[PDB]
Short mmCIF file of C-alpha atoms in Angstrom, two decimals:
data_model
loop_
_atom_site.label_atom_id
_atom_site.label_comp_id
_atom_site.label_asym_id
_atom_site.label_seq_id
_atom_site.Cartn_x
_atom_site.Cartn_y
_atom_site.Cartn_z
CA UNK Y 1 0.00 0.00 0.00
CA UNK Y 2 1.07 3.55 -0.87
CA UNK Y 3 2.39 5.75 1.96
CA UNK Y 4 3.71 8.76 0.02
CA UNK Y 5 2.12 12.16 0.92
CA UNK Y 6 -0.51 13.59 -1.40
CA UNK Y 7 -1.38 17.26 -1.92
CA UNK Y 8 -2.54 19.38 1.05
CA UNK Y 9 -6.13 18.54 1.85
CA UNK Y 10 -8.93 19.87 4.01
CA UNK Y 11 -10.88 17.19 5.89
CA UNK Y 12 -14.12 17.97 7.73
CA UNK Y 13 -14.87 15.34 10.39
CA UNK Y 14 -18.41 14.99 11.76
CA UNK Y 15 -19.09 12.81 14.81
CA UNK Y 16 -22.45 11.11 15.33
CA UNK Y 17 -24.07 8.26 17.20
CA UNK Y 18 -24.63 4.65 16.14
CA UNK Y 19 -28.47 4.49 16.34
CA UNK Y 20 -31.37 3.92 13.85
CA UNK Y 21 -35.77 -4.24 18.68
CA UNK Y 22 -34.73 -3.33 22.28
CA UNK Y 23 -32.59 -0.13 22.46
CA UNK Y 24 -31.06 1.78 25.46
CA UNK Y 25 -30.28 5.25 24.02
CA UNK Y 26 -27.60 6.97 26.12
CA UNK Y 27 -26.88 10.71 25.74
CA UNK Y 28 -23.12 10.48 25.97
CA UNK Y 29 -21.03 13.57 26.42
CA UNK Y 30 -17.92 13.91 24.22
CA UNK Y 31 -15.42 15.51 26.59
CA UNK Y 32 -12.54 15.19 24.07
CA UNK Y 33 -11.49 13.00 21.16
CA UNK Y 34 -8.57 12.01 18.91
CA UNK Y 35 -8.69 11.70 15.11
CA UNK Y 36 -6.12 9.46 13.37
CA UNK Y 37 -5.74 9.62 9.59
CA UNK Y 38 -3.95 6.84 7.68
CA UNK Y 39 -2.68 6.37 4.15
CA UNK Y 40 -3.38 3.21 2.01
CA UNK Y 41 -0.22 1.54 3.36
CA UNK Y 42 -1.04 2.27 7.02
CA UNK Y 43 1.27 5.28 7.59
CA UNK Y 44 -0.05 8.28 9.57
CA UNK Y 45 -1.11 10.96 7.06
CA UNK Y 46 -0.34 13.59 9.73
CA UNK Y 47 0.02 13.86 13.54
CA UNK Y 48 -3.25 12.91 15.40
CA UNK Y 49 -5.84 15.66 15.91
CA UNK Y 50 -6.77 16.53 19.49
CA UNK Y 51 -10.44 17.57 19.74
CA UNK Y 52 -12.30 19.17 22.65
CA UNK Y 53 -16.02 18.89 23.62
CA UNK Y 54 -17.63 19.04 20.14
CA UNK Y 55 -18.72 16.83 17.18
CA UNK Y 56 -16.94 18.63 14.26
CA UNK Y 57 -13.21 19.08 13.34
CA UNK Y 58 -11.49 20.85 10.39
CA UNK Y 59 -8.13 19.16 9.73
CA UNK Y 60 -5.71 20.93 7.36
CA UNK Y 61 -2.40 19.19 8.23
CA UNK Y 62 -3.23 16.06 6.19
CA UNK Y 63 -3.11 15.19 2.52
CA UNK Y 64 -5.08 13.65 -0.38
CA UNK Y 65 -3.27 10.38 0.54
CA UNK Y 66 -5.59 9.90 3.61
CA UNK Y 67 -7.74 6.73 3.17
CA UNK Y 68 -9.07 5.96 6.70
CA UNK Y 69 -10.15 8.03 9.69
CA UNK Y 70 -10.32 6.52 13.20
CA UNK Y 71 -11.85 8.39 16.13
CA UNK Y 72 -11.49 7.63 19.85
CA UNK Y 73 -13.46 9.77 22.32
CA UNK Y 74 -12.97 10.43 26.04
CA UNK Y 75 -9.48 9.01 26.63
CA UNK Y 76 -8.05 12.53 27.30
CA UNK Y 77 -4.88 14.27 26.03
CA UNK Y 78 -2.76 12.51 23.42
CA UNK Y 79 0.64 12.95 25.25
CA UNK Y 80 1.32 10.27 27.87
CA UNK Y 81 -2.01 8.63 26.92
CA UNK Y 82 -2.92 5.24 25.43
CA UNK Y 83 -2.28 6.42 21.86
CA UNK Y 84 0.97 8.45 22.36
CA UNK Y 85 3.17 5.76 20.65
CA UNK Y 86 0.81 5.04 17.67
CA UNK Y 87 2.83 5.41 14.43
CA UNK Y 88 0.79 3.24 12.05
CA UNK Y 89 -2.69 1.82 11.48
CA UNK Y 90 -1.41 -1.61 12.71
CA UNK Y 91 -0.38 0.14 16.00
CA UNK Y 92 -3.72 1.85 16.51
CA UNK Y 93 -5.68 -1.38 15.84
CA UNK Y 94 -3.78 -3.09 18.70
CA UNK Y 95 -4.25 -0.34 21.38
CA UNK Y 96 -6.17 -1.50 24.49
CA UNK Y 97 -7.27 0.39 27.59
CA UNK Y 98 -7.95 -1.04 31.06
CA UNK Y 99 -11.27 -1.05 32.84
CA UNK Y 100 -9.60 0.44 35.95
CA UNK Y 101 -7.06 3.21 36.42
CA UNK Y 102 -3.57 2.35 37.91
CA UNK Y 103 -4.96 2.19 41.51
CA UNK Y 104 -7.13 -0.81 40.25
CA UNK Y 105 -10.04 0.58 42.35
CA UNK Y 106 -11.43 3.40 40.16
CA UNK Y 107 -13.05 2.78 36.75
CA UNK Y 108 -11.94 4.46 33.53
CA UNK Y 109 -15.69 4.33 32.62
CA UNK Y 110 -18.00 6.81 34.42
CA UNK Y 111 -21.50 8.15 33.62
CA UNK Y 112 -19.83 11.46 32.59
CA UNK Y 113 -16.92 9.84 30.61
CA UNK Y 114 -17.50 6.77 28.48
CA UNK Y 115 -14.94 5.64 25.88
CA UNK Y 116 -16.32 5.62 22.30
CA UNK Y 117 -14.72 4.75 19.03
CA UNK Y 118 -15.49 4.60 15.34
CA UNK Y 119 -13.91 4.66 11.89
CA UNK Y 120 -14.66 5.68 8.32
CA UNK Y 121 -13.27 5.59 4.79
CA UNK Y 122 -11.90 8.96 3.50
CA UNK Y 123 -12.98 9.87 -0.09
CA UNK Y 124 -11.69 12.81 -2.18
CA UNK Y 125 -12.83 11.80 -5.75
CA UNK Y 126 -9.86 13.63 -7.40
CA UNK Y 127 -10.34 16.72 -5.22
CA UNK Y 128 -8.54 18.21 -2.21
CA UNK Y 129 -11.62 18.34 0.07
CA UNK Y 130 -13.24 15.54 2.00
CA UNK Y 131 -16.32 15.28 4.23
CA UNK Y 132 -16.03 12.37 6.72
CA UNK Y 133 -18.83 11.21 9.08
CA UNK Y 134 -17.78 8.82 11.88
CA UNK Y 135 -20.38 6.89 13.88
CA UNK Y 136 -19.24 6.31 17.47
CA UNK Y 137 -20.05 3.24 19.57
CA UNK Y 138 -19.37 2.53 23.25
CA UNK Y 139 -16.27 0.45 23.97
CA UNK Y 140 -17.91 -0.87 27.18
CA UNK Y 141 -21.13 -2.75 28.02
CA UNK Y 142 -23.53 -1.71 30.79
CA UNK Y 143 -25.11 -4.09 33.34
CA UNK Y 144 -28.14 -2.94 35.43
CA UNK Y 145 -29.57 -4.81 38.43
CA UNK Y 146 -33.27 -4.89 39.47
CA UNK Y 147 -33.92 -6.72 42.78
CA UNK Y 148 -37.42 -8.00 43.67
CA UNK Y 149 -37.05 -9.21 47.24
CA UNK Y 150 -39.81 -11.64 48.39
CA UNK Y 151 -37.73 -13.25 51.16
CA UNK Y 152 -39.43 -13.21 54.57
CA UNK Y 153 -38.07 -13.09 58.14
CA UNK Y 154 -34.48 -12.25 57.16
CA UNK Y 155 -33.78 -11.12 60.77
CA UNK Y 156 -35.07 -12.09 64.22
CA UNK Y 157 -35.04 -15.86 63.58
CA UNK Y 158 -32.57 -18.76 64.02
CA UNK Y 159 -31.13 -18.08 60.56
CA UNK Y 160 -30.34 -14.51 59.63
CA UNK Y 161 -29.23 -13.07 56.29
CA UNK Y 162 -27.82 -9.59 55.86
CA UNK Y 163 -27.25 -8.43 52.28
CA UNK Y 164 -23.86 -6.72 51.93
CA UNK Y 165 -23.31 -5.68 48.31
CA UNK Y 166 -24.18 -5.95 44.63
CA UNK Y 167 -20.91 -7.21 43.10
CA UNK Y 168 -19.48 -7.81 39.63
CA UNK Y 169 -17.12 -10.75 39.45
CA UNK Y 170 -14.59 -11.20 36.63
CA UNK Y 171 -15.15 -8.00 34.70
CA UNK Y 172 -12.99 -8.19 31.54
CA UNK Y 173 -9.85 -6.04 32.01
CA UNK Y 174 -9.12 -5.16 28.33
CA UNK Y 175 -11.05 -2.60 26.34
CA UNK Y 176 -10.27 -2.88 22.63
CA UNK Y 177 -11.05 0.26 20.69
CA UNK Y 178 -10.74 -1.41 17.26
CA UNK Y 179 -10.28 -4.88 15.90
CA UNK Y 180 -12.63 -7.74 15.27
CA UNK Y 181 -15.79 -8.48 17.20
CA UNK Y 182 -14.08 -11.74 18.42
CA UNK Y 183 -10.97 -9.87 19.71
CA UNK Y 184 -13.19 -7.38 21.65
CA UNK Y 185 -14.72 -10.19 23.83
CA UNK Y 186 -11.53 -12.21 24.49
CA UNK Y 187 -10.16 -11.84 28.05
CA UNK Y 188 -7.46 -13.54 30.07
CA UNK Y 189 -7.23 -10.82 32.82
CA UNK Y 190 -10.06 -9.60 35.02
CA UNK Y 191 -11.15 -7.37 37.86
CA UNK Y 192 -13.43 -8.68 40.62
CA UNK Y 193 -15.54 -6.96 43.31
CA UNK Y 194 -15.24 -9.77 45.87
CA UNK Y 195 -12.97 -12.82 46.13
CA UNK Y 196 -13.24 -14.01 49.80
CA UNK Y 197 -15.10 -17.27 49.01
CA UNK Y 198 -13.75 -20.86 48.70
CA UNK Y 199 -12.11 -21.80 45.35
CA UNK Y 200 -12.40 -18.36 43.76
CA UNK Y 201 -10.90 -18.22 40.25
CA UNK Y 202 -7.70 -16.20 40.62
CA UNK Y 203 -5.66 -16.52 37.37
CA UNK Y 204 -4.90 -12.93 36.25
CA UNK Y 205 -7.54 -11.53 38.64
CA UNK Y 206 -7.27 -8.16 40.48
CA UNK Y 207 -9.74 -6.97 43.16
CA UNK Y 208 -11.51 -3.65 42.55
CA UNK Y 209 -13.68 -1.79 45.06
CA UNK Y 210 -15.40 -0.11 42.05
CA UNK Y 211 -17.08 -3.52 41.43
CA UNK Y 212 -18.88 -3.65 44.81
CA UNK Y 213 -21.87 -1.40 45.67
CA UNK Y 214 -22.92 -1.59 49.34
CA UNK Y 215 -26.49 -2.56 50.26
CA UNK Y 216 -28.18 -0.75 53.14
CA UNK Y 217 -31.34 -1.75 55.12
CA UNK Y 218 -34.37 -0.59 53.12
CA UNK Y 219 -32.59 -0.73 49.69
CA UNK Y 220 -34.15 -4.11 48.75
CA UNK Y 221 -37.96 -4.39 48.76
CA UNK Y 222 -40.74 -6.22 46.80
CA UNK Y 223 -39.94 -3.43 44.28
CA UNK Y 224 -43.31 -3.60 42.43
CA UNK Y 225 -42.07 -0.69 40.23
CA UNK Y 226 -38.90 -2.60 39.01
CA UNK Y 227 -36.57 0.27 39.97
CA UNK Y 228 -32.84 -0.27 39.21
CA UNK Y 229 -30.56 -0.70 42.26
CA UNK Y 230 -27.22 -0.02 40.48
CA UNK Y 231 -25.29 -0.49 37.27
CA UNK Y 232 -21.71 -1.41 36.30
CA UNK Y 233 -19.68 -0.69 33.18
CA UNK Y 234 -17.52 -3.56 31.99
CA UNK Y 235 -15.71 -4.77 28.92
CA UNK Y 236 -16.51 -7.62 26.46
CA UNK Y 237 -16.21 -11.13 27.82
CA UNK Y 238 -17.24 -14.33 25.91
CA UNK Y 239 -16.37 -16.28 29.06
CA UNK Y 240 -14.11 -18.76 27.24
CA UNK Y 241 -11.53 -18.17 30.05
CA UNK Y 242 -13.89 -17.06 32.85
CA UNK Y 243 -17.41 -15.64 32.48
CA UNK Y 244 -18.48 -12.41 34.12
CA UNK Y 245 -20.88 -12.91 37.09
CA UNK Y 246 -23.33 -10.42 38.63
CA UNK Y 247 -24.36 -11.23 42.20
CA UNK Y 248 -25.90 -10.09 45.42
CA UNK Y 249 -23.30 -10.97 48.10
CA UNK Y 250 -24.74 -11.52 51.58
CA UNK Y 251 -23.77 -12.87 55.00
CA UNK Y 252 -25.69 -15.84 56.43
CA UNK Y 253 -25.50 -16.40 60.22
CA UNK Y 254 -26.62 -19.70 61.82
CA UNK Y 255 -25.71 -20.08 65.48
CA UNK Y 256 -21.98 -19.42 65.84
CA UNK Y 257 -21.22 -19.46 62.10
CA UNK Y 258 -21.28 -16.57 59.59
CA UNK Y 259 -20.45 -17.26 55.95
CA UNK Y 260 -20.71 -15.50 52.58
CA UNK Y 261 -23.64 -16.47 50.32
CA UNK Y 262 -24.52 -15.31 46.84
CA UNK Y 263 -27.55 -14.79 44.58
CA UNK Y 264 -25.70 -14.89 41.24
CA UNK Y 265 -26.14 -14.83 37.47
CA UNK Y 266 -23.41 -16.18 35.15
CA UNK Y 267 -23.04 -14.41 31.78
CA UNK Y 268 -22.74 -17.69 29.84
CA UNK Y 269 -24.80 -19.12 26.97
CA UNK Y 270 -26.30 -21.78 29.35
CA UNK Y 271 -27.15 -19.57 32.40
CA UNK Y 272 -27.98 -15.95 31.43
CA UNK Y 273 -28.21 -17.08 27.72
CA UNK Y 274 -25.91 -14.06 27.09
CA UNK Y 275 -22.22 -13.39 27.29
CA UNK Y 276 -21.00 -9.78 27.53
CA UNK Y 277 -20.63 -7.78 24.30
CA UNK Y 278 -19.44 -4.18 23.88
CA UNK Y 279 -22.20 -1.71 23.05
CA UNK Y 280 -24.94 -3.76 24.77
CA UNK Y 281 -26.98 -2.84 27.82
CA UNK Y 282 -28.05 -5.79 30.03
CA UNK Y 283 -30.92 -5.65 32.45
CA UNK Y 284 -30.80 -8.34 35.14
CA UNK Y 285 -33.96 -8.85 37.26
CA UNK Y 286 -33.39 -11.07 40.31
CA UNK Y 287 -36.52 -12.24 42.22
CA UNK Y 288 -35.66 -13.74 45.61
CA UNK Y 289 -38.04 -15.74 47.79
CA UNK Y 290 -38.17 -18.05 50.81
CA UNK Y 291 -38.74 -17.84 54.58
CA UNK Y 292 -35.17 -17.13 55.75
CA UNK Y 293 -35.76 -17.84 59.50
CA UNK Y 294 -37.19 -21.25 58.37
CA UNK Y 295 -34.21 -22.19 56.08
CA UNK Y 296 -35.43 -20.82 52.74
CA UNK Y 297 -33.94 -18.10 50.50
CA UNK Y 298 -30.32 -19.06 51.31
CA UNK Y 299 -28.61 -18.54 47.93
CA UNK Y 300 -25.38 -20.41 47.11
CA UNK Y 301 -21.90 -20.69 48.65
CA UNK Y 302 -20.24 -20.84 45.16
CA UNK Y 303 -21.16 -18.02 42.77
CA UNK Y 304 -18.97 -19.55 40.00
CA UNK Y 305 -21.25 -22.64 39.68
CA UNK Y 306 -24.76 -22.29 38.11
CA UNK Y 307 -27.71 -22.20 40.53
CA UNK Y 308 -30.75 -24.47 40.12
CA UNK Y 309 -33.24 -23.36 42.84
CA UNK Y 310 -36.85 -22.08 43.24
CA UNK Y 311 -35.53 -19.41 45.69
CA UNK Y 312 -33.74 -17.45 42.87
CA UNK Y 313 -35.53 -16.41 39.64
CA UNK Y 314 -33.42 -14.46 37.11
CA UNK Y 315 -34.29 -12.80 33.79
CA UNK Y 316 -31.57 -11.29 31.60
CA UNK Y 317 -32.41 -9.08 28.66
CA UNK Y 318 -29.96 -7.42 26.30
CA UNK Y 319 -30.57 -4.19 24.41
CA UNK Y 320 -28.43 -2.25 21.97
CA UNK Y 321 -26.59 0.44 23.98
CA UNK Y 322 -26.82 3.38 21.57
CA UNK Y 323 -24.60 6.46 21.78
CA UNK Y 324 -26.28 9.84 21.41
CA UNK Y 325 -23.09 12.03 21.46
CA UNK Y 326 -23.61 15.52 22.94
CA UNK Y 327 -21.31 18.57 23.55
#
């Protein structure tokens, strides 16, 4: 492929969403973005463009040799960032970001800053001017939890259960901005919100407090209105190494023994009937029942093994998580 510079060009880049069948449309703010332009042979056509909080850029440092435009939003300044050493298209296609910052306990993904990426062909048709529209998609997936609690006598009896947290176990660590759909869901490193249970999977696993949301008395009710308790952002995970698991983690006390118990859902084809894909929004409804004081509604000791019980009813639905980029 040709990598020689062409004549000076003017490129107008327009950023838009990936919308237009269950759909979760998310108004996502573009805080900043980077635009990479590449020639036919993969060379940079010019230094990457650093954009602010907008959806339009005029690039005049490039040439008529530009063939592809890649856009990454909300990763911050170019220098010292994930893309600072990108020299070619092959380099950019391999860049990955982590789900957590270097403390391991704070997410790179927040409601006010979600990574988005997209790409487009650049066409000049013999001219020196090009109009390029790039549709952005979320790099992450979103998981929401709805709890319908029909358990009775959780306190006051012989057996007591105290719910402690909604936790995400084995969140995929790697966020691929580009590459194949298969590459985006392959993981061999993970973060986990809780790991103090017998036989917890630990190969390439790091604990993260960002993957545990505390439960307080009064938070869980019959919830006739199906209100959402919390949500987590995570990356793609086909579960071929370890599936992602959403659970309620609780403490069961019987006489002189307290132990962790779980009300979990495995994101596998056989349990949830869904693995985790980027750009999807999962709604998990967990209906709990049983007379706790009488031995019912006790969950499971191993959240990594599928649960077959009348006491836990789980529905998992997946919707397209659509970007609606705003300034």
